[PDB]
Amino acid sequence: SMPFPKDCSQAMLNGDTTSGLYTIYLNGDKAQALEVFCDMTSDGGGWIVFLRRKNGRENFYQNWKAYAAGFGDRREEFWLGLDNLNKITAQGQYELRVDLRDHGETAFAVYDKFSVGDAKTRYKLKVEGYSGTAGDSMAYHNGRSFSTFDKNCALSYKGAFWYRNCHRVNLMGRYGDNNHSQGVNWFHWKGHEHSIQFAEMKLRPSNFRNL
Ligand SMILES: N#Cc1ccc(CNC(=O)N2CCOCC2)cc1
Incomplete structure (x- = not known):
């Protein structure tokens, strides 16, 4: 060991x-x-x-x-x-x-x-x-800085991520929220209106x- x-x-x-x-x-x-x-x-x-x-x-x-x-x-x-x-x-x-x-x-x-x-x-x-x-949903995010509401995608979607304008991946989004782009999303798998369990x-x- x-x-x-x-x-x-x-x-x-x-x-x-x-x-x-x-x-x-x-x-x-x-x-x-x-x-x-x-x-x-x-x-x-x-x-x-x-x-x-x-x-x-x-x-x-x-x-x-x-x-x-x-x-x-x-x-x-x-x-x-x-x-x-x-x-x-x-x-x-x-x-x-x-x-x-x-x-x-x-x-x-x-x-x-x-x-x-x-x-x-x-x-x-x-x-x-x-x-x-x-599906390659992180490519969209490559080279981006991290964003939180206090440092606006984080505020608009009430999550945090390496946001761009704004996301194809939102795995720190709102749990069970199927509203467009609000939830736990991986766009090139389940889109923006399907929060992943x-x-x-x-x-x-x-x-x-x-x-
Ligand atoms: N994986 C993980 C993970 C990371 C941090 C936490 C809680 N925060 C934490 O441990 N920090 C640093 C040490 O003293 C308390 C504050 C929970 C899960």
Whole structure:
């Protein structure tokens, strides 16, 4: 086992194959402990989950500081934090996976290159190298800064995201809201008038597929 695993891939290779809460260590630094939910079953496992929607119990209409820091219950609905995402994605080349499920139908998107810039970039999104079944709805968002109501798409749709004008992905939108562009949307899968029941966003090293 690795003593200070820097992500869920180094925690999984540590022989922990059950999905659930693990400690990772940013930059392998024992002073930078972070509790994360690891999805150890989806497409080979080793994924840090950084967003989960599943029941509408948690409020995602939250401010910049909340999106920077993270909020919620890792075992249920939560957001990991943009500062965490920046520090993880700085450690190497990461891949994004998005898992979606609605009324028994499932879809996914994988982006071979995924990174989140630091606060001086307003947590700029990079997403490249799409494959999957959900449709490439993140391409629209590539290179955009993060937006919250207090830093207007976030205000207009009462969510938070790497908004443009405004979205094809709104996974931090209002739960069960089928009104146009208000809900948990992935446009190239279920459009803007269908709020998705279950959504996860997760990341792991892009080289995990052959390590
Ligand atoms: N994944 C995740 C996730 C991230 C943060 C929270 C709650 N916020 C939080 O832990 N911060 C940082 C440490 O002290 C308390 C404030 C919940 C879920």
